[PDB]
Amino acid sequence: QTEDYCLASNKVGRCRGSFPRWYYDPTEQICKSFVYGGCLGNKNNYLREEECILACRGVQ
Amino acid sequence: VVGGTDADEGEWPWQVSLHALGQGHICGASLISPNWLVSAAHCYIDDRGFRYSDPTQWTAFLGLHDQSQRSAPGVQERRLKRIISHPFFNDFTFDYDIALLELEKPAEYSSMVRPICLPDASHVFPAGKAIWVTGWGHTQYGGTGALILQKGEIRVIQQTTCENLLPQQITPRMMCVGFLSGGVDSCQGDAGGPLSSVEADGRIFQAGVVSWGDGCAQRNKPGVYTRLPLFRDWIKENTGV
Numbered sequence: 001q002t003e004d005y006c007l008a009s010n011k012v013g014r015c016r017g018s019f020p021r022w023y024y025d026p027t028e029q030i031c032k033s034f035v036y037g038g039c040l041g042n043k044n045n046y047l048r049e050e051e052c053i054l055a056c057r058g059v060q
Numbered sequence: 061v062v063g064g065t066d067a068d069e070g071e072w073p074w075q076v077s078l079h080a081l082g083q084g085h086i087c088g089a090s091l092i093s094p095n096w097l098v099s100a101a102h103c104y105i106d107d108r109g110f111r112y113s114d115p116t117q118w119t120a121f122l123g124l125h126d127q128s129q130r131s132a133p134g135v136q137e138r139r140l141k142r143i144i145s146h147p148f149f150n151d152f153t154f155d156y157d158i159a160l161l162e163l164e165k166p167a168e169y170s171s172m173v174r175p176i177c178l179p180d181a182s183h184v185f186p187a188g189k190a191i192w193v194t195g196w197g198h199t200q201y202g203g204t205g206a207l208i209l210q211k212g213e214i215r216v217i218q219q220t221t222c223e224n225l226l227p228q229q230i231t232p233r234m235m236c237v238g239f240l241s242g243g244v245d246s247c248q249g250d251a252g253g254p255l256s257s258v259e260a261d262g263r264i265f266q267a268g269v270v271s272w273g274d275g276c277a278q279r280n281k282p283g284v285y286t287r288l289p290l291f292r293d294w295i296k297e298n299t300g301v
């Protein structure tokens with residue numbers, strides 16, 4: 001499960017909204033900003049940096 | 061908008077910017093009357109613990125030119141009272157990607173703020189016609205927004221071509237607009253914004269709504285837009301416009 005929530009690449013998708021989101025990067029061990037299109041994203045997609053940090057704290 | 065240029069001030073007085081709470085600009089929209097905006101359904105779906113369908117969560121900026129100058133003269137700020145997503149909207153196929161947004165208080169028409177014309181249900185925007193896409197969206201896929209409103213001239217693509225470029229993904233509610241050559245396209249942040257088409261008397265009609273694309277500005281991957289004429293009666297029935 002941490003596989004999906006923390007280890008998956010960020011996914012912009014095909015939709016053309018600009019939703020500011022956060023994703024965990026396990027190579028840097030840090031949550032970073034990205035822009036989500038709004039449709040069919042994966043689980044490594046957080047509304048807030050703090051929520052991303054909580055979800056993926058310590059993950060390698 | 062990829063491969064566009066800065067719009068002139070006052071050039072697209074129907075172009076609107078929609079901001080969600082704590083998140084800045086999310087989607088575009090078009091003004092169609094003093095009370096109503098047309099936008100994309102997929103912008104207003106509950107997600108990640110945030111209620112994008114909740115009208116209180118949004119702010120519309122009208123007469124906006126530059127995102128860093130939202131208090132410039134002529135810029136009108138409005139709350140939403142109502143969001144009507146099309147009932148047949150499907151968030152897997154992106155079919156019926158259209159929404160109507162009701163302003164809490166009416167827009168005041170000015171040199172900066174004016175509605176776009178709506179086409180009759182029977183009207184056809186012909187293949188090959190040069191039309192315009194506008195927005196503050198990304199200048200490159202996976203890139204960054206534009207402070208200054210962008211415009212890009214694109215062309216209506218034949219439905220048969222469109223279907224073959226994106227097999228099993230194009231419905232009759234959808235229209236490909238762009239270039240088979242790529243280079244000019246809408247992009248993330250442009251969704252909900254209008255296609256603008258100069259018609260027989262010089263007046264501008266809305267040809268469609270920015271929806272989706274496979275990346276942005278790629279060869280043989282034009283933008284996919286929601287048609288407008290098909291939804292003319294739905295708009296009338298729900299808004300009186």
Ligand SMILES: N[C@@H](CCC(=O)N[C@@H](CS)C(=O)NCC(=O)O)C(=O)O
Binds near residue numbers: 177264265
């Ligand atoms: N009838 C309007 C003025 C005309 C107007 O702003 N119409 C719009 C919507 S039909 C329009 O022509 N916009 C497109 C354009 O100016 O090119 C009024 O008196 O308030």
